[PDB]
């Protein structure tokens, strides 16, 4: 499923992502735009041999199990396949685990380079929320 910008914002808010850990909703929409262009089925290999999955391009070295990444931790306790569903629940729950501690949304390079330090509230312009 390729979500619309506001469509995704609304689905995220139905899972309480708005202001999760202090990150306003636009941060997550901005991250999803530049990670996956809003496509839940996006998959992309990395130079370390891990792969990123789903609308937030969550990695298989640390977060999900894809059965082919040496030394994977699966800290979200989920098959990476689950992050490709049209239902964003699994991606949201894993994103919440990622942001629960550590470097927060800095786990996403795209967030750090494209979203951090900008007015991310622009990303929910014109969205009924
Ligand atoms: O900085 C990088 C970046 Br950027 C990409 C890549 C590669 C690559 C190729 C494909 Br195809 C692919 O799907 C992905 Br992901 C990466 C690559 C290129 C030539 C030979 C072997 C690889 S290898 O590393 O894949 O063996 C290597 C370095 Br170094
Ligand atoms: O030195 C190389 C060079 Br150059 C290319 C490639 C690859 C590759 C090659 C072709 Br051709 C291609 O069409 C695609 Br896509 C990827 C490759 C890259 C990453 C992962 C798997 C492959 S794999 O496909 O080789 O398993 C690996 C090495 Br090592
Ligand atoms: Na894995």
From Swiss-Prot:
Residues reported to bind substrate: 101
Name of the protein in question: Lysozyme C
C-type lysozyme domain residues: 1-129
Annotated organism of origin: Gallus gallus
Active-site positions on this chain: 35, 52
Enzymatic reactions: Hydrolysis of (1->4)-beta-linkages between N-acetylmuramic acid and N-acetyl-D-glucosamine residues in a peptidoglycan and between N-acetyl-D-glucosamine residues in chitodextrins
Entry annotated with the keyword Secreted: yes
Keyword vocabulary terms for this entry: Allergen, Antimicrobial, Bacteriolytic enzyme, Disulfide bond, Glycosidase, Hydrolase, Secreted, Signal
Record EC number: 3.2.1.17
CDD domains: LYZ_C
Main location: secreted
GO CC annotations on file: cytoplasm; endoplasmic reticulum; extracellular space
Lineage: Eukaryota, Metazoa, Chordata, Craniata, Vertebrata
Assembly and interaction partners: Monomer.
UniProt GO BP: cell wall macromolecule catabolic process; defense response to bacterium; defense response to Gram-negative bacterium; defense response to Gram-positive bacterium; killing of cells of another organism
Family designation: Belongs to the glycosyl hydrolase 22 family.
Annotated GO MF terms: beta-N-acetylglucosaminidase activity; identical protein binding; lysozyme activity
